[PDB]
Motif scaffolding. Structure first.
Motif, PDB file in Angstrom:
ATOM      1  N   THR A 227       0.826  -1.201   0.000  1.00 54.00           N
ATOM      2  CA  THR A 227       0.000   0.000   0.000  1.00 54.00           C
ATOM      3  C   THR A 227       0.862   1.254   0.000  1.00 54.00           C
ATOM      4  OG1 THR A 227      -1.832  -1.110   1.117  1.00 54.00           O
ATOM      5  CG2 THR A 227      -1.721   1.284   1.281  1.00 54.00           C
ATOM      6  N   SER A 230       2.621   1.779  -3.359  1.00 49.63           N
ATOM      7  CA  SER A 230       1.727   2.077  -4.469  1.00 49.63           C
ATOM      8  C   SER A 230       1.367   3.552  -4.565  1.00 49.63           C
ATOM      9  CB  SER A 230       0.446   1.251  -4.348  1.00 49.63           C
ATOM     10  OG  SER A 230      -0.256   1.583  -3.165  1.00 49.63           O
ATOM     11  N   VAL A 231       1.716   4.350  -3.566  1.00 52.82           N
ATOM     12  CA  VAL A 231       1.428   5.787  -3.611  1.00 52.82           C
ATOM     13  C   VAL A 231       2.251   6.425  -4.723  1.00 52.82           C
ATOM     14  CG1 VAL A 231       1.522   7.930  -2.327  1.00 52.82           C
ATOM     15  CG2 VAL A 231       0.874   5.815  -1.176  1.00 52.82           C
ATOM     16  N   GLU A 270      -1.863  11.392   0.838  1.00 55.29           N
ATOM     17  CA  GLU A 270      -2.385  10.200   0.182  1.00 55.29           C
ATOM     18  C   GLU A 270      -2.040   8.940   0.963  1.00 55.29           C
ATOM     19  OE1 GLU A 270      -4.226   9.521  -2.460  1.00 55.29           O
ATOM     20  OE2 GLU A 270      -3.828   7.370  -2.637  1.00 55.29           O
ATOM     21  N   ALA A 271      -0.800   8.837   1.446  1.00 53.45           N
ATOM     22  CA  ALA A 271      -0.403   7.656   2.202  1.00 53.45           C
ATOM     23  C   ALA A 271      -1.179   7.548   3.506  1.00 53.45           C
ATOM     24  CB  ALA A 271       1.100   7.687   2.471  1.00 53.45           C
ATOM     25  N   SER A 273      -4.181   8.783   4.152  1.00 54.50           N
ATOM     26  CA  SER A 273      -5.558   8.423   3.836  1.00 54.50           C
ATOM     27  C   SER A 273      -5.672   6.948   3.481  1.00 54.50           C
ATOM     28  CB  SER A 273      -6.078   9.290   2.693  1.00 54.50           C
ATOM     29  OG  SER A 273      -5.983  10.664   3.016  1.00 54.50           O
ATOM     30  N   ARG A 274      -4.738   6.440   2.674  1.00 51.00           N
ATOM     31  CA  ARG A 274      -4.780   5.034   2.290  1.00 51.00           C
ATOM     32  C   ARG A 274      -4.628   4.129   3.501  1.00 51.00           C
ATOM     33  NH1 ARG A 274      -1.805   3.596  -3.505  1.00 51.00           N
ATOM     34  NH2 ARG A 274      -2.856   5.227  -4.719  1.00 51.00           N
ATOM     35  N   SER A 277      -7.855   4.291   5.663  1.00 50.82           N
ATOM     36  CA  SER A 277      -9.007   3.638   5.052  1.00 50.82           C
ATOM     37  C   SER A 277      -8.833   2.125   5.020  1.00 50.82           C
ATOM     38  CB  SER A 277      -9.230   4.184   3.644  1.00 50.82           C
ATOM     39  OG  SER A 277      -8.423   3.503   2.703  1.00 50.82           O
ATOM     40  N   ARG A 278      -7.662   1.649   4.595  1.00 51.75           N
ATOM     41  CA  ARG A 278      -7.468   0.217   4.410  1.00 51.75           C
ATOM     42  C   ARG A 278      -7.308  -0.523   5.732  1.00 51.75           C
ATOM     43  NH1 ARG A 278      -4.469   0.211  -1.161  1.00 51.75           N
ATOM     44  NH2 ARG A 278      -5.829   2.049  -1.044  1.00 51.75           N
TER      45      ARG A 278
END
Ligand SMILES: CCCCCCCCCCC(CCCCCCCCCC)(CO[C@@H]1O[C@H](CO)[C@@H](O[C@H]2O[C@H](CO)[C@@H](O)[C@H](O)[C@H]2O)[C@H](O)[C@H]1O)CO[C@@H]1O[C@H](CO)[C@@H](O[C@H]2O[C@H](CO)[C@@H](O)[C@H](O)[C@H]2O)[C@H](O)[C@H]1O
Ligand SMILES: CCCCCCCCCCC(CCCCCCCCCC)(CO[C@@H]1O[C@H](CO)[C@@H](O[C@H]2O[C@H](CO)[C@@H](O)[C@H](O)[C@H]2O)[C@H](O)[C@H]1O)CO[C@@H]1O[C@H](CO)[C@@H](O[C@H]2O[C@H](CO)[C@@H](O)[C@H](O)[C@H]2O)[C@H](O)[C@H]1O
Ligand SMILES: [Zn+2]
Ligand SMILES: [Zn+2]
Ligand SMILES: [Zn+2]
Ligand SMILES: [Zn+2]
Ligand SMILES: [Zn+2]
Lengths: 307, 307
Positions: A227, A230-231, A270-271, A273-274, A277-278
């Motif tokens: 994860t 992938s950012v 972004e990282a 938030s990811r 969320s995940r």
């Protein structure tokens, strides 16, 4: 703004008051049951009833530790306890496991001493009466729980308690009619103590994993690393740390080596938030570094090898 | 390159081999002493000798836990244990404390049972001989340690052991000449058990502070916060977490809100260097954010209040 996406709910939720009331009622009932069973077993000189009372003591201790952790996990984090007081739940679980081991060991030693140099007398009537009372109490608790999540967990726990009480009652019935079979009490104590230790092993394993600063059971190292990688902009990753304060509180940290033509703020947002969320990390700190060509050469900047 | 300033030393240092050899020798000597004292006290039906043997068992367990932690703190960090195995030392210390509490409680119960319904006989000759042997062994250990840091710590520990052995020997001398004073054994057991628990309290406090994810004792919240805020460019700080894997392994994390006209790489490098130099943090992860005007308004972006 980090940590600004969610909001902290202050005060006491109405459902938490109900949970506290249920825990109080369960603790009171289990304490009364334990006291009655201790009195009955002492009157009967029985060790199986000691085993049942020890199990009830373990139940009471676990619920009291849960109540204490619930009360503690409301004070604000101090300057000496930056993360809060969430580790109190794990510490209470460990304390309950240790106390159960202590009482089980004492009972096992007593049963072993009883088995060889078999010098003891067991009152059949008192033991039978106490076992019948315990079975009736377990049946009443199961019926009440069925009439009234936490309730279902209490119901299945009471069903297991009732099975153990049925075993103790069978042993007491055998002893009462045939007094020559006094050995059924130490044997039952041994069987139930081994069962208790086997049941307590998984919780001890989980508590040890949490306390040793290990990765949380549900969260995997590779999914989190993939994860993060992938950012758009992240080139590498090192010093990725995942650990849990408790079974529900997870913390994460990592160093992100981003490309030169990348925006650190966007990558960080972004990282974060990811990850939130995940995996639902309660706390997340990411150090956004710059991917120098020497990053891929340092020995310490290499992830642990595959298991 | 963050974390590239120091270097990791591989292999086994020559001094660590010497430390392992000393720990092996000390464990062997203390185990032999414990076995001899257990045999002597059992032959003498004495409880003070049980207290001394329990102290020796605590010493052996502590040294064995230290050896196990030393062996464990050489495996590389895995994907399930990202921080390594440094928490094993704290867990071993906690286990030793718990075992000491167990044995002390058993001995205290035995002494209390002895005091009321005083039905026991103590062999004066055997108890006196065992106490004299223990005193001579402690004197020999002290002399050997003086003839040969860790050695000084062992020397002072052996001096304390010798004082306790002298107390036990005085009790044995009193019992041997005047057999009517059998009560000197349970009384000595009580005194030494209270002393042992009082001595074990501080280590338990430190272990609990480490395990509850609290701030390390030496490192202060305010000095670290002032160091971080003194970096040119930093305007605020939130989510500053300080905790220790063990007594010597300290971890730190923080979110730094820097000015718009600041260089995140320079701020990160300077803050990491300052933290490493001033406090010697083994791990340090800093999230360099941008100081929005809304940062000073969020409730979660506020440091804990002064104690
Ligand atoms: C009107 C009033 C209603 C009051 C209701 C009170 C409810 C609150 C207490 C409920 C309660 C005590 C029951 C006490 C006696 C009953 C009360 C008598 C009331 C008489 C009026 C029942 O907890 C029981 O615990 C057992 C093990 O402890 C578990 O069994 C297990 O093995 C089975 C093997 O077959 C298997 O089948 C089953 O699947 C297994 O999970 C049972 O399923 C579960 O029911 C405990 O509540 C919580 O339950 C959690 C579930 O796990 C328990 O575990 C949590 O933490 C663990 C590590 O922290 C972690 O490892 C767990 O993952 C995590 O989940 C918590 O520690 C505990 O706090
Ligand atoms: C040729 C062969 C030589 C072999 C040499 C082996 C040396 C290695 C073992 C030395 C040893 C065992 C002695 C065993 C019996 C003797 C061996 C017999 C040999 C016979 C041939 C002596 O450890 C003793 O420990 C006592 C408490 O445990 C301590 O006393 C204390 O209260 C006093 C109250 O008055 C006071 O005065 C004194 O100041 C206090 O500190 C003593 O000062 C100290 O000497 C333990 O070694 C280490 O010592 C550390 C110091 O603390 C100890 O604590 C560390 O961790 C704690 C929490 O993890 C933390 O809380 C501590 O802060 C930290 O420091 C470690 O746990 C232990 O691993
Ligand atoms: Zn139960
Ligand atoms: Zn590197
Ligand atoms: Zn000692
Ligand atoms: Zn931040
Ligand atoms: Zn905020």
């Amino acid at each position: 703004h980090c940590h600004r996406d969610p909001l902290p709910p202050p005060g006491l939720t109405p459902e938490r008051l109900h949970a506290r009331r249920q825990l109080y009622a369960a603790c009171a009932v289990c304490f009364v049951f334990m006291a009655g069973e201790v009195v009955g077993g002492y009157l009967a000189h029985s060790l199986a009833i000691m085993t049942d009372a020890a199990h009830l003591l373990a139940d009471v201790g676990s619920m009291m530790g849960s109540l204490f952790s619930l009360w503690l996990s409301t004070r604000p984090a101090t300057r000496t306890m930056t993360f809060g007081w969430h580790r109190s739940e794990t510490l209470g679980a460990l304390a309950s496991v240790v106390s159960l081991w202590m009482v089980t060991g004492i009972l096992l030693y007593l049963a072993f001493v009883r088995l060889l140099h078999s010098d003891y007398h067991i009152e059949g009537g008192a033991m039978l009466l106490t076992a019948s009372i315990a079975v009736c109490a377990n049946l009443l608790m199961a019926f009440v729980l069925h009439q009234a999540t936490s309730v279902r967990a209490a119901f299945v726990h009471v069903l297991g308690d009732l099975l153990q009480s049925f075993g103790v009652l069978a042993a007491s019935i055998l002893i009462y009619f045939k007094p020559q079979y006094k050995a059924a009490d130490p044997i039952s104590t041994f069987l139930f103590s081994i069962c208790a230790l086997g049941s307590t092993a998984p919780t001890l394993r989980d508590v040890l994993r949490i306390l040793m600063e290990g990765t949380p059971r549900n969260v995997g190292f590779e999914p989190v690393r993939d994860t993060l990688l992938s950012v758009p902009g992240v080139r590498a990753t090192h010093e990725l740390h995942l650990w849990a304060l408790t079974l529900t509180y997870h913390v994460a940290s990592a160093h992100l080596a981003i490309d030169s033509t990348a925006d650190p703020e966007a990558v960080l947002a972004e990282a974060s938030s990811r990850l939130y969320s995940r995996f639902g990390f309660s706390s997340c700190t990411l150090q956004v570094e710059q991917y120098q060509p020497e990053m891929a050469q340092c020995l310490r900047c290499q992830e642990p090898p595959q298991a």
